[PDB]
Amino acid sequence: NVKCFNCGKEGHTARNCRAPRKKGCWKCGKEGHQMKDCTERQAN
DNA sequence: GTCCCTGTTCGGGC
Ligand SMILES: [Zn+2]
Ligand SMILES: [Zn+2]
């Protein structure tokens, strides 16, 4: 399973989510890199 | 192919 980054809901991922998405790193906020890329404070 | 999975509009991959 998974949880959508663009909205939260399971079943799909952000790419599949037909919703308004963010510019930068979904988790931390910064843009200069992506959520996958980021290893700032990915505790939970 | 049921379950897994991520950077665009939009479900493809095994
Ligand atoms: Zn979503
Ligand atoms: Zn980040």
Side-chain angles (χ1 to χ4, degrees):
Chain A
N1 72 310
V2 74
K3 0 179 179 178
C4 173
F5 319 101
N6 188 3
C7 86
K9 255 173 176 180
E10 311 193 77
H12 61 276
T13 42
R15 48 153 286 179
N16 302 306
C17 194
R18 303 193 188 191
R21 62 84 163 233
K22 179 182 300 301
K23 295 183 180 181
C25 187
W26 284 315
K27 187 61 171 181
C28 94
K30 294 169 187 166
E31 106 182 290
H33 63 260
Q34 300 284 52
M35 178 272 270
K36 286 185 167 175
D37 301 344
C38 177
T39 183
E40 291 169 61
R41 286 185 177 179
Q42 279 61 75
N44 62 271

Coordinates of all heavy atoms in Angstrom, one line a residue:
Chain A
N1 N 0.8 -1.2 0.0 CA 0.0 0.0 0.0 C 0.9 1.3 0.0 O 2.1 1.2 0.0 CB -1.0 0.0 1.2 CG -0.3 0.2 2.5 OD1 0.7 -0.4 2.8 ND2 -0.8 1.2 3.3
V2 N 0.2 2.4 -0.1 CA 0.8 3.7 -0.2 C -0.1 4.8 0.3 O -1.3 4.5 0.4 CB 1.2 3.9 -1.7 CG1 0.0 4.2 -2.5 CG2 2.3 5.0 -1.9
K3 N 0.4 6.0 0.5 CA -0.4 7.2 0.8 C 0.0 8.3 -0.1 O 1.2 8.6 -0.2 CB -0.3 7.6 2.3 CG 0.7 6.7 3.2 CD 0.7 7.3 4.6 CE 1.6 6.4 5.5 NZ 1.7 6.9 6.8
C4 N -0.9 8.9 -0.8 CA -0.7 10.0 -1.8 C 0.0 11.2 -1.1 O -0.4 11.6 0.0 CB -2.0 10.4 -2.4 SG -1.9 11.8 -3.5
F5 N 1.0 11.8 -1.8 CA 1.8 12.9 -1.4 C 1.0 14.2 -1.7 O 1.1 15.2 -0.9 CB 3.1 12.8 -2.1 CG 3.7 11.4 -2.1 CD1 3.6 10.7 -3.3 CD2 4.2 10.8 -0.9 CE1 3.8 9.3 -3.3 CE2 4.5 9.4 -0.9 CZ 4.3 8.7 -2.1
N6 N 0.3 14.2 -2.8 CA -0.6 15.3 -3.3 C -1.8 15.5 -2.4 O -2.4 16.6 -2.5 CB -0.8 15.1 -4.8 CG -1.5 16.2 -5.5 OD1 -1.8 17.3 -5.0 ND2 -1.8 15.9 -6.8
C7 N -2.3 14.5 -1.7 CA -3.6 14.6 -1.0 C -3.7 13.7 0.3 O -4.5 14.1 1.2 CB -4.8 14.3 -1.9 SG -5.3 12.6 -2.2
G8 N -3.0 12.6 0.4 CA -3.0 11.7 1.5 C -3.6 10.3 1.2 O -3.1 9.3 1.6
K9 N -4.8 10.3 0.5 CA -5.5 9.1 0.2 C -4.6 8.0 -0.4 O -3.8 8.3 -1.2 CB -6.7 9.4 -0.7 CG -8.0 9.3 0.2 CD -9.2 9.8 -0.6 CE -10.5 9.6 0.2 NZ -11.7 10.0 -0.5
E10 N -4.9 6.8 -0.1 CA -4.3 5.6 -0.6 C -4.8 5.3 -2.0 O -5.4 6.1 -2.7 CB -4.5 4.4 0.3 CG -4.2 4.7 1.8 CD -4.1 3.5 2.7 OE1 -3.0 2.8 2.6 OE2 -5.1 3.2 3.4
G11 N -4.5 4.1 -2.4 CA -5.0 3.5 -3.7 C -4.1 4.0 -4.9 O -4.0 3.3 -5.9
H12 N -3.7 5.3 -4.9 CA -2.9 6.0 -5.9 C -1.7 6.7 -5.3 O -1.6 6.8 -4.1 CB -3.8 7.0 -6.6 CG -4.4 8.0 -5.7 ND1 -5.5 8.0 -4.9 CD2 -3.9 9.3 -5.5 CE1 -5.6 9.2 -4.3 NE2 -4.6 10.1 -4.6
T13 N -0.9 7.3 -6.1 CA 0.2 8.1 -5.8 C 0.0 9.5 -6.4 O -0.9 9.7 -7.2 CB 1.6 7.5 -6.2 OG1 1.5 6.9 -7.5 CG2 2.0 6.4 -5.2
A14 N 0.9 10.5 -6.0 CA 0.7 11.9 -6.4 C 0.6 12.0 -8.0 O -0.4 12.6 -8.4 CB 1.9 12.7 -5.9
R15 N 1.5 11.4 -8.7 CA 1.4 11.3 -10.2 C 0.0 10.9 -10.7 O -0.4 11.5 -11.7 CB 2.4 10.3 -10.7 CG 2.5 9.0 -10.0 CD 2.9 7.8 -10.9 NE 1.9 7.4 -11.9 CZ 2.0 6.5 -12.8 NH1 3.2 5.8 -13.0 NH2 1.0 6.2 -13.6
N16 N -0.7 10.1 -10.0 CA -2.1 9.6 -10.4 C -3.2 10.5 -9.8 O -4.3 10.5 -10.3 CB -2.2 8.1 -9.8 CG -1.1 7.3 -10.5 OD1 -1.0 7.2 -11.7 ND2 -0.3 6.6 -9.6
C17 N -2.8 11.2 -8.7 CA -3.8 12.1 -8.0 C -4.1 13.3 -8.9 O -3.2 14.2 -9.2 CB -3.2 12.6 -6.7 SG -4.4 13.4 -5.6
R18 N -5.4 13.4 -9.3 CA -5.9 14.6 -10.1 C -6.2 15.7 -9.1 O -7.4 16.0 -9.0 CB -7.0 14.1 -10.9 CG -6.7 13.0 -11.9 CD -7.8 12.8 -12.9 NE -7.6 11.6 -13.7 CZ -8.3 11.3 -14.8 NH1 -9.2 12.2 -15.3 NH2 -8.1 10.1 -15.5
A19 N -5.2 16.3 -8.4 CA -5.4 17.4 -7.5 C -4.3 18.4 -7.6 O -3.2 18.0 -8.2 CB -5.4 16.8 -6.0
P20 N -4.4 19.6 -7.1 CA -3.4 20.6 -7.2 C -2.2 20.2 -6.3 O -2.3 20.1 -5.1 CB -4.0 21.9 -6.7 CG -5.5 21.7 -6.7 CD -5.7 20.2 -6.5
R21 N -1.0 20.0 -7.0 CA 0.2 19.6 -6.3 C 1.1 20.8 -6.0 O 0.9 21.9 -6.5 CB 0.8 18.5 -7.2 CG 1.3 18.9 -8.6 CD 2.7 19.5 -8.6 NE 3.2 19.5 -10.0 CZ 4.4 19.0 -10.4 NH1 5.3 18.5 -9.5 NH2 4.8 19.1 -11.7
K22 N 2.1 20.5 -5.2 CA 3.1 21.5 -4.7 C 4.3 21.6 -5.6 O 4.4 20.9 -6.6 CB 3.5 20.9 -3.3 CG 4.5 21.7 -2.5 CD 4.9 21.1 -1.2 CE 3.7 20.9 -0.2 NZ 3.1 22.1 0.2
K23 N 5.1 22.6 -5.4 CA 6.3 22.9 -6.2 C 7.5 22.1 -5.6 O 8.1 21.4 -6.3 CB 6.6 24.4 -6.2 CG 5.6 25.2 -6.9 CD 6.0 26.7 -6.9 CE 5.0 27.6 -7.6 NZ 5.4 29.0 -7.6
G24 N 7.7 22.3 -4.3 CA 8.9 21.7 -3.6 C 8.6 20.4 -2.9 O 7.4 19.9 -2.9
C25 N 9.6 19.8 -2.3 CA 9.7 18.7 -1.4 C 8.4 18.5 -0.6 O 8.1 19.4 0.3 CB 10.9 18.8 -0.5 SG 11.3 17.4 0.6
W26 N 7.6 17.5 -0.8 CA 6.3 17.3 -0.2 C 6.4 17.3 1.4 O 5.6 17.8 2.1 CB 5.6 16.1 -0.7 CG 5.0 16.3 -2.1 CD1 4.2 17.4 -2.4 CD2 5.0 15.4 -3.2 NE1 3.8 17.2 -3.8 CE2 4.3 16.1 -4.3 CE3 5.6 14.2 -3.5 CZ2 4.2 15.5 -5.6 CZ3 5.4 13.6 -4.8 CH2 4.8 14.3 -5.8
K27 N 7.5 16.6 1.9 CA 7.6 16.4 3.3 C 8.1 17.6 4.0 O 7.4 18.2 4.8 CB 8.5 15.2 3.5 CG 8.6 14.7 5.0 CD 7.3 14.3 5.6 CE 7.4 13.7 7.0 NZ 6.1 13.3 7.6
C28 N 9.4 18.0 3.8 CA 10.0 19.1 4.5 C 9.5 20.5 4.0 O 9.4 21.4 4.9 CB 11.5 19.0 4.4 SG 12.3 19.9 3.0
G29 N 9.2 20.7 2.7 CA 8.8 22.0 2.2 C 9.7 22.6 1.1 O 9.2 23.1 0.1
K30 N 11.0 22.6 1.3 CA 12.0 23.1 0.4 C 11.8 22.6 -1.0 O 11.2 21.5 -1.2 CB 13.4 22.8 1.0 CG 13.7 23.5 2.3 CD 15.0 22.9 2.9 CE 15.2 23.5 4.3 NZ 16.2 22.7 5.1
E31 N 12.4 23.2 -2.0 CA 12.1 22.8 -3.5 C 13.2 22.4 -4.3 O 13.1 21.4 -5.1 CB 11.5 24.0 -4.1 CG 12.3 24.9 -5.1 CD 11.4 26.1 -5.6 OE1 10.5 25.8 -6.3 OE2 11.7 27.2 -5.2
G32 N 14.3 23.0 -4.0 CA 15.7 22.8 -4.4 C 16.0 21.3 -4.6 O 17.0 21.0 -5.2
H33 N 15.2 20.4 -4.0 CA 15.3 19.0 -4.0 C 13.9 18.4 -3.8 O 13.0 19.1 -3.4 CB 16.3 18.5 -2.9 CG 15.7 18.9 -1.6 ND1 16.1 19.9 -0.8 CD2 14.8 18.2 -0.9 CE1 15.3 19.9 0.3 NE2 14.4 18.9 0.3
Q34 N 13.7 17.1 -4.0 CA 12.4 16.4 -3.9 C 12.3 15.6 -2.6 O 13.3 15.4 -1.9 CB 12.2 15.5 -5.1 CG 12.1 16.3 -6.5 CD 10.9 17.1 -6.7 OE1 10.4 17.9 -5.8 NE2 10.2 17.0 -7.8
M35 N 11.1 15.0 -2.3 CA 10.9 14.2 -1.1 C 11.8 13.0 -1.1 O 12.4 12.7 -0.1 CB 9.4 14.0 -0.9 CG 9.2 13.1 0.3 SD 9.2 11.3 0.1 CE 7.5 11.0 -0.3
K36 N 11.9 12.3 -2.2 CA 12.8 11.1 -2.4 C 14.2 11.6 -2.0 O 14.9 10.9 -1.3 CB 12.7 10.6 -3.8 CG 11.4 9.8 -4.1 CD 11.5 9.2 -5.5 CE 10.4 8.2 -5.8 NZ 10.5 7.7 -7.2
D37 N 14.7 12.7 -2.6 CA 16.0 13.2 -2.5 C 16.3 13.5 -1.1 O 17.4 13.3 -0.6 CB 16.1 14.5 -3.4 CG 15.8 14.3 -4.8 OD1 15.8 13.2 -5.3 OD2 15.5 15.4 -5.5
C38 N 15.4 14.2 -0.4 CA 15.5 14.7 1.0 C 15.7 13.6 2.0 O 15.1 12.6 2.0 CB 14.3 15.6 1.3 SG 13.9 16.3 2.9
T39 N 16.6 14.0 2.9 CA 17.0 13.2 4.1 C 17.3 14.2 5.3 O 18.1 13.9 6.1 CB 18.2 12.3 3.8 OG1 18.6 11.5 4.9 CG2 19.4 13.1 3.3
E40 N 16.5 15.3 5.3 CA 16.6 16.3 6.4 C 16.1 15.7 7.7 O 17.0 15.2 8.4 CB 15.7 17.5 5.9 CG 16.3 18.2 4.8 CD 15.3 19.2 4.2 OE1 14.9 20.2 4.9 OE2 15.0 19.1 3.0
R41 N 14.8 15.7 8.0 CA 14.2 15.2 9.2 C 13.0 14.3 8.8 O 11.9 14.5 9.2 CB 13.8 16.4 10.0 CG 15.0 17.1 10.7 CD 14.5 18.2 11.6 NE 15.6 18.8 12.3 CZ 15.5 19.8 13.2 NH1 14.3 20.3 13.5 NH2 16.6 20.3 13.8
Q42 N 13.3 13.2 8.1 CA 12.4 12.2 7.7 C 12.3 11.1 8.8 O 12.7 10.0 8.7 CB 12.7 11.5 6.4 CG 12.3 12.4 5.2 CD 12.9 13.8 5.2 OE1 14.0 14.0 4.9 NE2 12.1 14.9 5.6
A43 N 11.8 11.6 10.0 CA 11.5 10.7 11.1 C 10.3 9.8 10.9 O 10.4 8.6 10.8 CB 11.3 11.5 12.4
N44 N 9.1 10.5 10.6 CA 7.9 9.9 10.3 C 7.0 10.9 9.6 O 6.1 10.4 8.8 CB 7.2 9.4 11.6 CG 6.9 10.5 12.6 OD1 7.7 10.8 13.4 ND2 5.7 11.1 12.5
Chain B
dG1 O5' -3.3 -11.8 -15.0 C5' -3.0 -12.4 -13.8 C4' -2.6 -11.4 -12.8 O4' -1.4 -10.6 -13.2 C3' -3.6 -10.3 -12.5 O3' -4.6 -10.8 -11.6 C2' -2.8 -9.2 -11.9 C1' -1.3 -9.5 -12.4 N9 -0.8 -8.4 -13.2 C8 -1.4 -7.7 -14.3 N7 -0.7 -6.7 -14.7 C5 0.4 -6.7 -13.9 C6 1.5 -5.7 -13.8 O6 1.7 -4.7 -14.6 N1 2.4 -6.0 -12.8 C2 2.3 -7.1 -12.0 N2 3.2 -7.2 -11.0 N3 1.3 -7.9 -12.0 C4 0.4 -7.7 -13.0
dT2 P -5.7 -9.8 -10.9 OP1 -7.0 -10.6 -10.7 OP2 -5.8 -8.5 -11.7 O5' -5.1 -9.5 -9.4 C5' -5.0 -10.5 -8.5 C4' -4.1 -10.1 -7.3 O4' -2.9 -9.6 -7.8 C3' -4.7 -9.0 -6.4 O3' -4.3 -9.3 -5.0 C2' -4.1 -7.8 -7.0 C1' -2.7 -8.3 -7.4 N1 -2.0 -7.5 -8.4 C2 -0.6 -7.4 -8.3 O2 0.1 -8.0 -7.4 N3 0.1 -6.6 -9.2 C4 -0.5 -5.9 -10.2 O4 0.1 -5.2 -11.0 C5 -1.9 -6.2 -10.3 C7 -2.7 -5.6 -11.5 C6 -2.6 -6.9 -9.4
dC3 P -4.5 -8.3 -3.8 OP1 -4.6 -9.1 -2.6 OP2 -5.6 -7.4 -4.2 O5' -3.2 -7.4 -3.8 C5' -1.9 -8.0 -3.4 C4' -0.8 -7.0 -3.7 O4' -0.8 -6.6 -5.0 C3' -0.7 -5.8 -2.8 O3' 0.5 -5.8 -2.1 C2' -0.9 -4.7 -3.8 C1' -0.3 -5.3 -5.1 N1 -0.8 -4.6 -6.3 C2 0.1 -4.1 -7.3 O2 1.3 -4.2 -7.1 N3 -0.4 -3.4 -8.3 C4 -1.7 -3.3 -8.6 N4 -2.1 -2.6 -9.6 C5 -2.7 -3.9 -7.7 C6 -2.2 -4.5 -6.6
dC4 P 1.0 -4.5 -1.2 OP1 1.8 -5.0 -0.1 OP2 -0.2 -3.7 -0.9 O5' 1.9 -3.7 -2.2 C5' 3.1 -4.3 -2.7 C4' 3.8 -3.3 -3.8 O4' 2.9 -3.1 -4.8 C3' 4.2 -2.0 -3.1 O3' 5.6 -1.7 -3.4 C2' 3.3 -1.0 -3.9 C1' 3.0 -1.7 -5.2 N1 1.8 -1.2 -5.9 C2 2.0 -0.6 -7.1 O2 3.1 -0.3 -7.6 N3 0.9 -0.2 -7.8 C4 -0.4 -0.4 -7.3 N4 -1.4 0.0 -8.0 C5 -0.5 -1.1 -6.0 C6 0.6 -1.5 -5.4
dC5 P 6.4 -0.5 -2.7 OP1 7.8 -0.8 -2.8 OP2 5.7 -0.2 -1.4 O5' 6.1 0.7 -3.7 C5' 6.7 0.8 -4.9 C4' 6.2 2.1 -5.7 O4' 4.8 1.9 -6.0 C3' 6.2 3.4 -4.8 O3' 6.5 4.5 -5.5 C2' 4.7 3.5 -4.4 C1' 4.1 3.0 -5.7 N1 2.6 2.8 -5.6 C2 1.8 3.2 -6.7 O2 2.3 3.7 -7.7 N3 0.5 3.0 -6.7 C4 -0.1 2.3 -5.6 N4 -1.4 2.2 -5.6 C5 0.7 1.8 -4.5 C6 2.0 2.1 -4.6
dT6 P 7.9 4.9 -6.2 OP1 8.3 4.1 -7.3 OP2 8.9 5.2 -5.0 O5' 7.5 6.4 -6.7 C5' 6.5 6.5 -7.7 C4' 6.0 8.0 -7.8 O4' 5.2 8.3 -6.7 C3' 7.2 9.0 -7.9 O3' 7.5 9.2 -9.3 C2' 6.6 10.1 -7.2 C1' 5.8 9.4 -6.0 N1 6.7 9.0 -4.9 C2 7.5 9.9 -4.2 O2 7.7 11.0 -4.6 N3 8.2 9.4 -3.1 C4 8.0 8.2 -2.5 O4 8.6 7.9 -1.5 C5 7.0 7.3 -3.2 C7 6.5 6.1 -2.5 C6 6.4 7.7 -4.3
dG7 P 8.8 10.1 -9.7 OP1 9.1 9.8 -11.1 OP2 9.8 10.0 -8.6 O5' 8.1 11.6 -9.7 C5' 7.0 11.9 -10.5 C4' 6.7 13.4 -10.5 O4' 6.5 13.8 -9.1 C3' 7.7 14.3 -11.1 O3' 7.1 15.0 -12.2 C2' 8.3 15.0 -9.9 C1' 7.2 15.0 -8.9 N9 7.7 15.0 -7.5 C8 8.3 14.0 -6.9 N7 8.6 14.2 -5.6 C5 8.1 15.5 -5.4 C6 8.1 16.2 -4.2 O6 8.5 15.9 -3.1 N1 7.4 17.4 -4.4 C2 6.9 17.9 -5.6 N2 6.3 19.1 -5.5 N3 6.9 17.2 -6.7 C4 7.5 16.0 -6.6
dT8 P 7.3 16.5 -12.5 OP1 8.5 16.7 -13.4 OP2 7.1 17.4 -11.3 O5' 5.9 16.7 -13.4 C5' 5.8 16.1 -14.7 C4' 4.4 15.9 -15.1 O4' 3.8 15.0 -14.2 C3' 3.5 17.2 -15.2 O3' 2.7 17.1 -16.4 C2' 2.7 17.1 -13.9 C1' 2.5 15.6 -13.8 N1 2.1 15.2 -12.5 C2 0.8 14.6 -12.2 O2 0.1 14.2 -13.1 N3 0.4 14.6 -10.9 C4 1.2 15.0 -9.8 O4 0.6 15.1 -8.7 C5 2.5 15.4 -10.1 C7 3.5 15.6 -9.0 C6 2.9 15.5 -11.4
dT9 P 1.7 18.3 -16.9 OP1 2.0 18.6 -18.3 OP2 1.7 19.3 -15.8 O5' 0.3 17.5 -16.8 C5' 0.0 16.4 -17.7 C4' -1.2 15.7 -17.2 O4' -1.1 15.3 -15.9 C3' -2.5 16.5 -17.5 O3' -3.4 15.7 -18.2 C2' -2.9 16.8 -16.0 C1' -2.3 15.6 -15.2 N1 -2.1 16.0 -13.8 C2 -2.7 15.3 -12.8 O2 -3.5 14.4 -13.0 N3 -2.4 15.8 -11.5 C4 -1.6 16.8 -11.1 O4 -1.4 17.0 -10.0 C5 -0.9 17.4 -12.3 C7 0.1 18.5 -12.0 C6 -1.2 17.0 -13.5
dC10 P -5.0 15.5 -18.0 OP1 -5.6 14.8 -19.1 OP2 -5.6 16.8 -17.5 O5' -4.9 14.5 -16.7 C5' -5.5 13.2 -16.8 C4' -4.4 12.1 -16.6 O4' -3.1 12.6 -16.9 C3' -4.3 11.4 -15.3 O3' -4.9 10.1 -15.5 C2' -2.8 11.3 -15.0 C1' -2.2 11.6 -16.4 N1 -0.8 12.0 -16.4 C2 -0.2 12.3 -17.7 O2 -0.9 12.2 -18.7 N3 1.1 12.7 -17.7 C4 1.8 12.7 -16.6 N4 3.1 13.1 -16.7 C5 1.3 12.4 -15.3 C6 0.0 12.0 -15.3
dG11 P -5.0 9.0 -14.3 OP1 -6.2 8.2 -14.6 OP2 -5.0 9.7 -13.0 O5' -3.7 8.1 -14.5 C5' -3.4 7.5 -15.7 C4' -2.3 6.4 -15.6 O4' -2.1 6.2 -14.2 C3' -2.8 5.0 -16.2 O3' -1.7 4.3 -16.7 C2' -3.2 4.3 -15.0 C1' -2.2 4.8 -14.0 N9 -2.5 4.4 -12.6 C8 -3.7 4.4 -12.0 N7 -3.7 4.0 -10.7 C5 -2.3 3.8 -10.5 C6 -1.7 3.4 -9.3 O6 -2.2 3.1 -8.2 N1 -0.3 3.4 -9.4 C2 0.4 3.8 -10.6 N2 1.7 3.8 -10.5 N3 -0.2 4.1 -11.7 C4 -1.6 4.1 -11.6
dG12 P -1.1 4.6 -18.2 OP1 -1.1 6.0 -18.5 OP2 -1.6 3.6 -19.1 O5' 0.5 4.2 -17.8 C5' 1.3 5.1 -17.1 C4' 2.5 4.4 -16.5 O4' 2.2 3.9 -15.2 C3' 3.1 3.2 -17.3 O3' 4.5 3.1 -17.2 C2' 2.4 2.0 -16.6 C1' 2.3 2.5 -15.2 N9 1.3 1.9 -14.4 C8 -0.1 1.8 -14.7 N7 -0.8 1.3 -13.7 C5 0.1 1.1 -12.7 C6 -0.1 0.7 -11.3 O6 -1.1 0.4 -10.8 N1 1.1 0.6 -10.6 C2 2.3 0.9 -11.1 N2 3.4 0.8 -10.3 N3 2.5 1.4 -12.4 C4 1.4 1.4 -13.1
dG13 P 5.4 2.0 -17.9 OP1 6.7 2.6 -18.3 OP2 4.6 1.3 -18.9 O5' 5.7 1.0 -16.7 C5' 6.6 1.3 -15.7 C4' 6.6 0.2 -14.6 O4' 5.3 0.1 -14.0 C3' 7.0 -1.2 -15.1 O3' 7.9 -1.7 -14.2 C2' 5.6 -1.9 -15.0 C1' 5.1 -1.2 -13.8 N9 3.6 -1.5 -13.6 C8 2.6 -1.3 -14.6 N7 1.4 -1.6 -14.1 C5 1.6 -2.0 -12.8 C6 0.7 -2.4 -11.8 O6 -0.5 -2.5 -12.0 N1 1.3 -2.7 -10.6 C2 2.6 -2.6 -10.4 N2 3.1 -3.0 -9.2 N3 3.5 -2.3 -11.3 C4 3.0 -2.0 -12.5
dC14 P 8.7 -3.1 -14.5 OP1 9.8 -3.2 -13.6 OP2 8.8 -3.3 -15.9 O5' 7.6 -4.2 -13.9 C5' 7.0 -4.1 -12.6 C4' 6.7 -5.5 -12.1 O4' 5.4 -5.9 -12.7 C3' 7.7 -6.6 -12.5 O3' 7.7 -7.6 -11.5 C2' 7.1 -7.2 -13.8 C1' 5.6 -7.1 -13.5 N1 4.7 -7.1 -14.7 C2 3.8 -8.1 -14.9 O2 3.8 -9.1 -14.2 N3 2.9 -8.0 -15.9 C4 2.9 -6.9 -16.7 N4 2.0 -6.8 -17.7 C5 3.9 -5.8 -16.5 C6 4.7 -6.0 -15.5
Ligands
ZN1 ZN -4.1 11.9 -4.0
ZN2 ZN 13.1 18.2 1.7

